[PDB]
Structure formats: structure tokens, C-alpha cells
Scaffold this motif. Structure first.
Motif, PDB file in Angstrom:
ATOM      1  N   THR A  18       0.841  -1.176   0.000  1.00 38.05           N
ATOM      2  CA  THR A  18       0.000   0.000   0.000  1.00 38.05           C
ATOM      3  C   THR A  18       0.893   1.249   0.000  1.00 38.05           C
ATOM      4  O   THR A  18       0.560   2.117  -0.788  1.00 38.05           O
ATOM      5  N   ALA A  19       1.876   1.353   0.832  1.00 37.59           N
ATOM      6  CA  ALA A  19       2.739   2.549   0.878  1.00 37.59           C
ATOM      7  C   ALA A  19       3.495   2.675  -0.448  1.00 37.59           C
ATOM      8  O   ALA A  19       3.551   3.719  -1.078  1.00 37.59           O
ATOM      9  N   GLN A  20       4.075   1.570  -0.902  1.00 34.86           N
ATOM     10  CA  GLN A  20       4.813   1.637  -2.180  1.00 34.86           C
ATOM     11  C   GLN A  20       3.956   2.121  -3.356  1.00 34.86           C
ATOM     12  O   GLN A  20       4.341   2.962  -4.188  1.00 34.86           O
ATOM     13  N   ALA A  21       2.738   1.639  -3.430  1.00 34.06           N
ATOM     14  CA  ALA A  21       1.838   2.032  -4.532  1.00 34.06           C
ATOM     15  C   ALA A  21       1.614   3.533  -4.495  1.00 34.06           C
ATOM     16  O   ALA A  21       1.620   4.156  -5.599  1.00 34.06           O
ATOM     17  N   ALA A  22       1.429   4.068  -3.293  1.00 32.84           N
ATOM     18  CA  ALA A  22       1.204   5.526  -3.237  1.00 32.84           C
ATOM     19  C   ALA A  22       2.435   6.295  -3.659  1.00 32.84           C
ATOM     20  O   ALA A  22       2.325   7.308  -4.376  1.00 32.84           O
ATOM     21  N   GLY A  23       3.572   5.867  -3.163  1.00 34.32           N
ATOM     22  CA  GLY A  23       4.831   6.533  -3.495  1.00 34.32           C
ATOM     23  C   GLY A  23       5.166   6.463  -5.007  1.00 34.32           C
ATOM     24  O   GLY A  23       5.589   7.421  -5.698  1.00 34.32           O
ATOM     25  N   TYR A  24       4.915   5.277  -5.514  1.00 29.82           N
ATOM     26  CA  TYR A  24       5.216   5.105  -6.960  1.00 29.82           C
ATOM     27  C   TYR A  24       4.308   5.937  -7.858  1.00 29.82           C
ATOM     28  O   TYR A  24       4.832   6.521  -8.799  1.00 29.82           O
ATOM     29  N   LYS A  25       3.047   6.049  -7.539  1.00 30.56           N
ATOM     30  CA  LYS A  25       2.110   6.869  -8.384  1.00 30.56           C
ATOM     31  C   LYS A  25       2.611   8.278  -8.283  1.00 30.56           C
ATOM     32  O   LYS A  25       2.696   8.900  -9.354  1.00 30.56           O
ATOM     33  N   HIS A  27       5.559   9.344  -7.888  1.00 33.99           N
ATOM     34  CA  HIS A  27       6.831   9.404  -8.639  1.00 33.99           C
ATOM     35  C   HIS A  27       6.491   9.473 -10.168  1.00 33.99           C
ATOM     36  O   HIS A  27       7.126  10.317 -10.830  1.00 33.99           O
ATOM     37  N   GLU A  28       5.609   8.596 -10.526  1.00 30.78           N
ATOM     38  CA  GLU A  28       5.231   8.578 -11.989  1.00 30.78           C
ATOM     39  C   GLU A  28       4.630   9.914 -12.428  1.00 30.78           C
ATOM     40  O   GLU A  28       4.880  10.293 -13.596  1.00 30.78           O
ATOM     41  N   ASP A  29       3.893  10.536 -11.531  1.00 32.43           N
ATOM     42  CA  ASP A  29       3.252  11.844 -11.873  1.00 32.43           C
ATOM     43  C   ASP A  29       4.161  13.027 -11.709  1.00 32.43           C
ATOM     44  O   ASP A  29       3.726  14.125 -12.125  1.00 32.43           O
ATOM     45  N   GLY A  30       5.340  12.840 -11.151  1.00 27.33           N
ATOM     46  CA  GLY A  30       6.306  13.871 -10.941  1.00 27.33           C
ATOM     47  C   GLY A  30       5.829  14.886  -9.883  1.00 27.33           C
ATOM     48  O   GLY A  30       6.037  16.120 -10.001  1.00 27.33           O
ATOM     49  N   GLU A  31       5.162  14.333  -8.910  1.00 24.77           N
ATOM     50  CA  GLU A  31       4.641  15.140  -7.790  1.00 24.77           C
ATOM     51  C   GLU A  31       5.295  14.746  -6.481  1.00 24.77           C
ATOM     52  O   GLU A  31       5.863  13.650  -6.450  1.00 24.77           O
ATOM     53  N   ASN A  83      11.098   0.681 -11.652  1.00 25.02           N
ATOM     54  CA  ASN A  83      10.153  -0.360 -12.137  1.00 25.02           C
ATOM     55  C   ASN A  83       9.092  -0.770 -11.125  1.00 25.02           C
ATOM     56  O   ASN A  83       8.347  -1.750 -11.262  1.00 25.02           O
ATOM     57  N   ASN A  84       9.026   0.056 -10.067  1.00 23.57           N
ATOM     58  CA  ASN A  84       8.067  -0.215  -9.024  1.00 23.57           C
ATOM     59  C   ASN A  84       8.389  -1.597  -8.353  1.00 23.57           C
ATOM     60  O   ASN A  84       7.508  -2.363  -7.927  1.00 23.57           O
ATOM     61  N   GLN A  85       9.649  -1.935  -8.271  1.00 28.58           N
ATOM     62  CA  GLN A  85      10.069  -3.177  -7.599  1.00 28.58           C
ATOM     63  C   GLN A  85      10.465  -2.724  -6.176  1.00 28.58           C
ATOM     64  O   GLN A  85      11.171  -1.704  -6.035  1.00 28.58           O
ATOM     65  N   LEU A  86      10.046  -3.527  -5.192  1.00 23.01           N
ATOM     66  CA  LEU A  86      10.469  -3.125  -3.818  1.00 23.01           C
ATOM     67  C   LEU A  86      11.936  -3.442  -3.605  1.00 23.01           C
ATOM     68  O   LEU A  86      12.351  -4.608  -3.881  1.00 23.01           O
ATOM     69  N   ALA A  87      12.741  -2.517  -3.108  1.00 22.56           N
ATOM     70  CA  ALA A  87      14.170  -2.733  -2.836  1.00 22.56           C
ATOM     71  C   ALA A  87      14.314  -3.221  -1.408  1.00 22.56           C
ATOM     72  O   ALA A  87      15.065  -4.162  -1.046  1.00 22.56           O
TER      73      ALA A  87
END
Ligand SMILES: Nc1nc2c(ncn2[C@@H]2O[C@H](CO)[C@@H](OP(=O)(O)O)[C@H]2O)c(=O)[nH]1
Ligand SMILES: Nc1nc2c(ncn2[C@@H]2O[C@H](CO)[C@@H](O)[C@H]2O)c(=O)[nH]1
Ligand SMILES: [Ca+2]
Length: 104
Positions: A18-25, A27-31, A83-87
Motif C-alpha cells: 500500500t505505501a509503495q503504490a502511493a509513493g510510486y504513483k 513518482h510517476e506523476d512527478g509530484e 520499475n516499481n520493484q520493492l528494494a
């Protein structure tokens, strides 16, 4: 049992996803959100043995279970790549100053 234990904070895989999905969106939106502009690049100064490639981004994961929306990010963070892969999941708890250690 906790999938990731950050200090005294316990997180399941679903909390991380859930946290990663929010962070990644964002990032993708440049916000970004928060005065420290998250998500932002994570340089890996610590040299963690991540199994996914760089670049990495860090995004706060909260023990309240809420998605970070600004304000204090706490000590924990999810680290994802392009790539939205968890590190990994890391935290400043138990690390000196603003350094990080991995969540176990
Ligand atoms: N220790 C640490 N912080 C980093 C690195 N990449 C970026 N930073 C940022 O540097 C800031 C000072 O460590 C941190 O802010 P934070 O207090 O909000 O996590 C963090 O976002 C890194 O690899 N290691
Ligand atoms: N809660 C918490 N925050 C920390 C720690 N080390 C640094 N911080 C930073 O302090 C602020 C408030 O949590 C945020 O910028 C955190 O990233 C820590 O060990 N615990
Ligand atoms: Ca939870």
C-alpha cells in the motif's frame, strides 16, 4: 508475525504494498508531498544489498497504517525503484543521526 520490523513498528507485506503504490504513483506523476518532498531519490549511501537495480526512491511508511500525506514522515521508509520493484524497508530507528538500518 511482522513481515518487516522497523524498531518497534511492525509491518505486513500489505502495509508495504500500500505505501509503495502511493509513493510510486506520485513518482510517476512527478509530484511530491511533505516539506522533504517525498518520494525522492534514495542514494544508498549505506550500501544495502538490494537485489533490484537503482535508481531508488524512498517513501515513508507509517505505523498508523495511513498513507503518508505530508507532515512528519517518522523513521520508516519503503525503498522502490523505477520499475516499481520493492528494494527494501529501512528505518532511521536504531541508526545514528539520519542514517538508516534495514527493517528485519
Ligand atoms: N542516510 C541517508 N539519507 C539519504 C540518502 N539518499 C537520500 N537521503 C536523504 O537525506 C536526508 C538526510 O539523511 C534524509 O531525510 P529524512 O530525515 O527525511 O529521511 C534522506 O531523505 C541515503 O542514501 N542515506
Ligand atoms: N521517529 C523518528 N524520526 C527520526 C529518527 N532519525 C531521524 N528522524 C527524522 O526526524 C523527523 C521526525 O520523525 C523526520 O525527518 C525523520 O526522518 C528516528 O530515529 N525516529
Ligand atoms: Ca498494518
Amino acid at each position: 508475525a511482522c513481515d518487516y520490523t522497523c524498531g518497534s513498528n511492525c509491518y505486513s507485506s500489505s502495509d508495504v504494498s500500500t505505501a509503495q503504490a502511493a509513493g510510486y504513483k506520485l513518482h510517476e506523476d512527478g509530484e511530491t508531498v511533505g516539506s522533504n518532498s517525498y518520494p525522492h531519490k534514495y542514494n544508498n549511501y549505506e550500501g544495502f544489498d538490494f537485489s533490484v537495480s537503482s535508481p531508488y526512491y524512498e517513501w515513508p511508511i507509517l505505523s498508523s497504517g495511513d498513507v503518508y500525506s505530508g507532515g512528519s514522515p517518522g523513521a520508516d521508509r519503503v525503498v522502490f525503484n523505477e520499475n516499481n520493484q520493492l528494494a527494501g524497508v529501512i528505518t532511521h530507528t536504531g541508526a545514528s543521526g539520519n542514517n538508516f538500518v534495514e527493517c528485519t
